[model samples]
Target: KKVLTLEGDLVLGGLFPVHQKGGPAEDCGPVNEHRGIQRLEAMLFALDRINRDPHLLPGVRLGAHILDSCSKDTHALEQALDFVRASLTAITGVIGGSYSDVSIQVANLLRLFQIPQISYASTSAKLSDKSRYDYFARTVPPDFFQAKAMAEILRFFNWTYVSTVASEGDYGETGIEAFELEARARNICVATSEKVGRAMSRAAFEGVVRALLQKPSARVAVLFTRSEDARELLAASQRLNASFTWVASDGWGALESVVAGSEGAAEGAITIELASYPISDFASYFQSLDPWNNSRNPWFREFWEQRFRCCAAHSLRAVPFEQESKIMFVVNAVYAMAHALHNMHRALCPNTTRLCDAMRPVNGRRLYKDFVLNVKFDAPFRPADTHNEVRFDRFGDGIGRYNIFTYLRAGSGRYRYQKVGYWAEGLTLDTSLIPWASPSAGPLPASRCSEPCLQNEVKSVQPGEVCCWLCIPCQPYEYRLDEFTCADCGLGYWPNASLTGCFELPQEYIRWGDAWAVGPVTIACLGALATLFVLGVFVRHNATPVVKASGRELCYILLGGVFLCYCMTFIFIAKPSTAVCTLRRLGLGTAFSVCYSALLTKTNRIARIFGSPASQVAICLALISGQLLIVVAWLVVEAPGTGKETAPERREVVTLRCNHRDASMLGSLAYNVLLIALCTLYAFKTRKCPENFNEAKFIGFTMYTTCIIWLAFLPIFYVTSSDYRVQTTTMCVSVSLSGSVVLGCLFAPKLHIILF
Candidate 1:
């Protein structure tokens, strides 16, 4: 066994994956420079810095008993047992075991002895459960947040359908399961999910690739696998000539070895890596070390021999190591252990320089609760180029932050990873910086099982298939309710342009310029003009016998009533408002009353020939007053106001009309019909009395035609009552025609006799 130790007052146990084992025969394989050597050196560097500081632990010095895990769980457990034996002596805490599986194996054994273990890069979400691994904590955050970041990226690019592959282990299985849960919440659908074992055969990887091929429409694949498994899987895909856009987890982050031999298959791949800031002094300290000077490190000779391709007898030279992204995390983990010990020293031994009995052999339980869990200090190195305070949440997990990278062509036959975005709370991506896999491809490749529905279309999902669906266009009046249903908008409401929601339809009323209103209004204006001309002719002929014999008082009153009836057509044609509706009720009944009252008095005078002009005038006033009283009572009981009328057959339109207009209108018209019938009865009684009495004859003719016009209006008004426009037009035309009948019959002969 290879070991490196430093002697001091306090010792911390360390587990580093210095060697990556290859086959079943050997226990340790080649040197892992970035993941192993550099990370190990970072822990040693932190220890050296802590010991040199006078105020941290005061007069005491910190030391380390570090061992290599060989990147194997069994080997790591074997090394961990050494720390377990030392737990009773000087080892208070442990600082590593870089891989999740290695950390998990060591954590189970350490928790039984109450030895706290902190890892730098073991990010399995399962480790966050304190019930299972109470002594475990990490500087790096768990894969739960990383999986959520991956889901956000998929949603940002609008790639809904995807296939997934994960290595069968704690990191891979737990991470992929979290991602699947997040994807489902975001409505992203998975086409297929496949798993591969760590020691799976080439044929097994081929089976994974073939299973991916079955779902050809899922062009993007999410990979939650270790670097070795990712490499093997890509090689199998290359052999089978399958192309896919890959979204990878931190396990495969920007590390060159993942796609070293399968560069073609990894082009246009996106990966998430734990955010790391450069250590200011780590580069110089690392490059200055040599096998001759660093004699304490037993594995330095092997690392030097492999790195420089030389033997121990030959001259050694320094070279910069590969980018070690986890170096800061490893350094933070060491500092955390040291700070916990320092704080314990202060709490247990106040106003003293020596260790107290309680802390001489540190108690892991009190150290965790009183120091580590509550430790607060600014991190020596920033992870995301910000002033981050190093701390742990309730789950013993660090803050979630990551750097997003994409693989692009570097030069001839090579690809390089480029930093394109980041994730702090959510993804902040610059899509313009990305170069897709193929030169001829569009800006972004689509990876959906079904095309997105149009604005007017709704989705109809197929049975047992959430991602796969058909588009069904919604009717103009319908809106989308869910993935498989459409609902109709309520009466007087319509769907908006996108069919996502509904809005109230505009009210329908008779506009003045409408085709239906123009005819009646034009005729009413002509009738008004003709009535004014007859009034002028009668005024000019005031002294003539025909004008005097025509009962001028009643004739002038009747013409004024005719003018008002013509004016009422305009109120009906105008837009309905409370004021306009009120005027319509009053003017409609009162105008008819003025004309019919004059006609009733004239025919009575002719039938009796005994009534004085003053009595005739008094009778007309009484009849007009009765009609006014009825209208006032109707207005007070149910005031005229506009209301909406919606029909079942045409739900999209609302008709504006007066409230209770039908009942009130019939009541007003019933009185006028009664007046018309009485006039007609008196005209019939005096029909034989005047062949030479031309005024009675003309008055008789006026009542007959007016009765016919009003009789025809009642049936037509009831038939089209549901439609406001048709009903309003019928009422206007009837009123105007009644006025026209009076003007043409009662006044035409007088005007002719006076003019000609």
Candidate 2:
């Protein structure tokens, strides 16, 4: 049955290990897998043609031989082979080691028999890693291929940083190594790589995950281990916050198992594998193809995804009908193989040894393309056959639907899945900004603490639309920025709010602090103080020395007293902000009264000086008392009014506050007018009355200056209308300037002139 050739060079070798009895499904949960049976089916499918197509074993008819890898029982494998050889003369090649360890066991047995034993899927990364042990050609891609593609996918998703945990099994080691190698190929950074044993170490996984989170987290991670004890790690990740996307390799490709215990957290995960269809859809397809028997396809594993925890994971394209694409590759490969065999049969010999020449034509992608798919294979197995290089394109999701989708927890503690991401064509997936209606009119970006696009107004909308994400202000009414000075109080802002910065008080409230009344009060106090002080200075210093008093000093005392009384009349009214708002009319009224009183006294003094000193003294005393009475009369006659800007406050036109008080109070105005008339008359009367006592020249100058300022204030006090405010409120300065200057010049000792 078996020939004795050598110790190591000749090749190729399989059988499903029926657990001598009924055994349970292995605990290759959501992440890890040993698809031995799947490989068996593919290899068996490839081998089936040996009987149907004569090209399979050209010059030889080698009957099918199965090996038992029971605990990798090599003795039994030899027995099975010896039994098969009982009928056959010689065996050249055989294949089967669905499991990596099982393949090594068969390799030992086959070494003695000198048969080429090719284990189609003995791909655990390290099993034959020692200088490439000679007996295997994998049916599936090795870690280098699988891991590289996975790493590329990781980079494509911008998950450049990843982590891995491999269970201590052959599948775990190979799967993890592939992830690591692929990670390197794509230039991705691997943050954590650890090996754990079968029984889940919850604490250890939690610690690893915690450390991962402490660093700048990667947005995606590759889970290379199986689902058996991997659930604990998944739980730890959920607790730690799955910072990156979770992905697993073929060893853990079952979607159901991946999400089984931790599917709630597994919702955001992605998985990669050699077989894409072994995912849920493929299982469904396999079941549908043969309802009574679920084992029709080796790739479709018996997956158990709890609705509440995890569901079977798969690369979508590999699932059944979608595998129309994968079907094309298989059909193409088989058909090309048949064609090559037939051609070789015609060209050479029909013997199996000569069929090897036909194998070259049966090689790669051109065969796949003939089966209704399109692909370009740049790297060809050239020199002889350009057909050897191939690619698998399963009509991929053009929209790149390879997204981690919505992972909602199912009622049964598993999860129900729905793919998430941009789905329908030509539609925008909303992963961006939101807002409320604009503060003024339309909508705006969500009103955050962030500064608004515009301040204090409506924003303009963008063109080509009803409204835009863009803002304008309320025009002013009572208030104005263009007054070129401080703005007047607007009706809404209120007087308090306007200048005072207080809110809600009425506009008139600003007038309470006016200077009109307060200014006069200040003058009244100063006058009283001046009167007492001047008299005391005169009495204390000059009165006792009357007989020896210098006429020059007497002149100083008189002039000082004169100026004091003259300048004090403005206390009769008010002015706003600067002082209280008051009756300028009353203020002017008192001024006229004082003017006439002084005029009368001056007339009397002129009369007395020509006659006697006694007459002059009597005249001056009466005049002083008269001036005092005049101020008293003005105050007693005018009571302060109700707070109003018009009515009692205004004079003359009644709508304005001018230099006129009540028409009934015009007596003061008349009195002043009369004084002016008399002064003019006195000026004439004294023109030649005494050349030695010539005070008329001094009086004339004061009269001219005093009359001018008083006359100017005439319009401001009386003629100013209700709308007009007295910008210049002080008119009493008219009398004060004239009186004070004249007195300061005439009677001050320094201002004396000799009669010469």
Candidate 3:
């Protein structure tokens, strides 16, 4: 006796327990859910029927055993496989599906076990790959084949630019891959082939629909969705004032549910199906199995009434639905397996050497023909069928012949025959195609290209890369979509969409800007401003005349760099961009420190003259001019990390100061902070205190600006991202920096009149 093993996810019918009391005979949960007690009932019925008749097996008796292994666990499945492998010596064949992925696992293991394992209903294309597993077989073709049929139908209608919309699922991606490959080969360019998955909300698919509406000339959309996602995608496509030809794959062949849900939108659509009951010559068979005469929406209800209507569909009378369709093919599949097994037993002899010797099929082609209306395996694994009985069939029109069906509008009261060609078996589909089709190309190199190609990521076009219209990606505080686009940086950033466009700001950035970029520089800048403001207001009266005049002017110039940058810091635009935020910090810090130092340098020279002898003061003032020139020379490299005058990564934005950010930003920041802090402390400490205290008395008030504001700003600027809250304390303190300078000059006694 040949033992057979199978894996099972569900115990009953493909769809389990039907609604018992209130509703129609609806499934308890999902229709595709392959479980229910009813399926087991049917299996038991078949077992009893098969065993009761001695003619079915003659002298041999068959035994049935089942394994109810849940489909999800990989470890449980592997264990089940081990059981089947142990039984492989006696196992002539295998049957039953354990979900798509699990079935592939069992199927692959069968090949290793070297036995024929047939899938009752695993639709995933991963298995049945003949190259890898010569023993695998399944009754239903994968969605891969159905997708090809749909694609070919689109080509027949001259729908050049195809859009394949599918629910994001295993079947969806697999089916779309089929459609994509076919479209590429058929010269039918795909405008857009997108997927929507299971966990997604209904609103998620709407995004694709809106995108499709803007595109025209793409007149066909192949919806290869599972029943779950089809309901919304179909309705959304129809409601949006869009009319496009549609071809639903086998998954959507159940017209009642898909159509009813779409309301009137499904009227003109068409679907490909595997079966339809006979309405004419086999009327005798139909009457014997007259199953649901009372159904309002009976299965094959239209087929019984509308078969002749489609042939001469103009005027035909309706008839009551009687029999179940697709039953013949299923029943025949059982018969073929039985026939092969019986023959194998009958012909068994001592001469039989191998397990394959048991496959002495009584014309497998003849057996296949006895079952399928027209469909047959192409290569007929047993090597006997030449006609390749597999074919696509129409449901309502012919007795056994199949073709594609299109639903006609209600005015016609007939389903139009959009296509009548025999279904083409996907003999050409090589499962190996995926690896070959993948993008093996590496990442794009750093190059200046005018336009980013459509298939790849887009970046700003640089002037050097092209002749005109240079644009770049939004750096930190803002983002621009695609290439050649611009977005203004929200408060914290100065609307820089590329590398060099961003301006440096102070550490007390939030004190001045509307928003804050989270970094240390803004806080530091605020600290400097707060200290400077306090000192300038309180200590200015004690400064030498020249020190007061030049130092006051220097404060305003410092504001030129400080005001805009600090103001930008408080202006928040939230995005946790690490590199951009860090770079902005270093740049802003350098700018603030440079401004403070320049002011202190000028004040130091003038104060030296007033406090010292005439000779010392004269000598110091003369060297100050040369020292200023040296500062200017250092400014070239100090300000712009590189002296490159090239156009920034974008147009419309210009580099104002030392704009480039690089490794040198660290050194630049260090130099800037050291100079500014020392100068502020030195000028204040030396201002007429004996000698060192002398300068402190003179310019000590300037330290107030950094002292007051930074305490409030440092926390917000460095810690808060611009996207969080656009405003920081830096903006307010920057304005106050000017105020302190004016007040300091007004207060002091001798120099008060002069500075005031």
Candidate 4:
């Protein structure tokens, strides 16, 4: 099989659907329909580039013998057979049919003849079986990878339940089946599976929509079809006012014709497509290809007539390649062959100036076995002429990335593809650039099975649903850290009001170091110093009539009790303990009882026939003994020991309080009240007497002020709430004021008269 062609032309062959007999389409015309014209131009553009570059083929040229498939399997086969019948030795590589069914047939036939066929768009999963079709290879990815990408889109948006539809063919059926299988594994449910054809009747299309509508849970519809079937389905759905978030296959996902005239109805649609690189300069170059420059392109005249609606122009230099995605794929496919061929030529013709020399006539068999089957070079149609190799797996399928596109309205009844994320060949989905489900809401759609737990509670996961849960408040010793789990406060810590975490509590007491306790302590000290000063003034003039008139023995006993009462404030001010509580209650009761009893003795002596000093001392001792007995009984029954009382709302701080029954506290005050009443009655009875020795005026005022101070103490202490320091401070102030009054009115006048 030898070629009778010129020496410079390096002939290659291909199949493209330049014309289709029956189907609605985009880029449709009398001759140039579908993406064939641009695809064919991409191959020619790459060939011309290879010939112009001295580094590639120094003295050689490249040429292509492209055939029109006419979108028919019979036509594709007839053209492919003619290419194979031509000089097999002269042909470097063969670019097969763009359609899967067409390519699969050509691939099976070419393998027997040992001619390697590279497909630009054949994505059938069965074609991955290299054992059956060893010569079959494709620059495009397999259908299963498309399924994987579709599943990722469903998973990312949480579209768990959806309806599926596809054109009734190998391309759509197989692609949808592959996706359906993967989706089931991800727990995605298919509400219905409907099959339609490229020429589905409007009634049949409406039936599919009605079946989809019957499943109320189906808000998303995934369509796997060729562009024509997709366009018909969308048109039918639009007419019926059917609304759904449409998920699309790569076939019609980027086709732009599927949602034609119904862009508004296609809002919230999503799709996946092949990752493409820009060829803007080559895009400009594509327009210059016509019958005038390349006489080999047979459809040039027909393409020119349909495009401009006029006679074919002989001077047409730049005709725009409206369909760019398919052209880019074709350019990459040709560059792959070119790069591999260049390597093969260098390997065969090393240390030679001539590339297409007579010695190494292009052997298709050797090129297929060595270079084409084993090639791994970056197709030049990639970004910036990069060398990112198009390495094939053992199954002869090239692994690739898919751009996940979110279709958004671009206004003026048009929608545009917005790249939201990417799905790579390694089954990794990078969705950081993905936007919110609702752009105005600015958040991902609510897809959780249950609402989030609150701040005080931990999540209780349902048996099978991780995303579903009930909230339970933290148990007794636990505190909340986050929504999911509760953390233990541990042995010695307590939770704050919000229970976010635990903290150690501060030790509480009325201490001089604190500003609250210091005031009471200072007043206690001042009262002590004053009492001591009064004692010094009295002892310095012990023989004076003013002191003796008040009864020297009884007056000294009263002053001593008053001094002891002022010193007793230390017990109340200090932190509560069993010892402090016992000493405070006993000292306060007994010392005040002594002062009141002494006043009673003096008052009674003034009222009755003057009693003997022994009798007075006996009465004073008897009264104080009764008070001591009452205090002892109160202490044994319900002793004032430290205990805590925390308000439910104010859990941040705990109150350490004196634990005593109200009855015990009141009983202690009762005996003092009785003694004060007795003293008051005797003073009032003797008030009218004119004895110079009697100071009943002082006795009457002292008892009245003392009773009034205590009357005020009860309500103040009861209303203090859990503020222990404030209660203790109030009691201290009461004691200090009472002692100061008795000293100022009773003993202070006697002392002042003696000194001045």
By TM-score, the best candidate is 1
Between candidates 2 and 4, the one scoring higher on lDDT is 4
| lDDT at position 509, candidate 4 | 58
Tens digits of lDDT, candidate 4, 90-112:
45667757667778777666665
Clash pairs, candidate 4, are: 287-319
lDDT of 2 by residue, 609-706 (tens): 64443444555445445544664575566543423333322221212232323333433453464456356556445432353456655545544554
Error of 1 at 104 (Å): 5.2
Q: How much does candidate 1 score in TM-score?
A: 0.65
Minimal lDDT window, size 10, model 2: 429-438
Off by over 4 Å in 4: 1-10, 22-30, 33-36, 55-57, 87-89, 184-187, 197-200, 231-242, 293-299, 308-314, 355-366, 373-376, 379-395, 409-417, 425-436, 439-756
Q: What is model 3's C-alpha RMSD? A: 23.1
Error of model 2, residue 569, in angstroms? 66
* lDDT by candidate, in order shown: 0.70, 0.41, 0.43, 0.63
Instruction: Tell me each candidate's TM-score.
Output: 0.65, 0.37, 0.40, 0.53
**Of 2 and 3, the candidate ranking higher by TM-score:** 3
Scored by lDDT, the top model is 1
Question: Candidate 3, residues 253-301: lDDT per residue as tens digits?
Answer: 6455665545455544556665443223223333333323422112223
| Ranking, lDDT, top scorer first | 1, 4, 3, 2
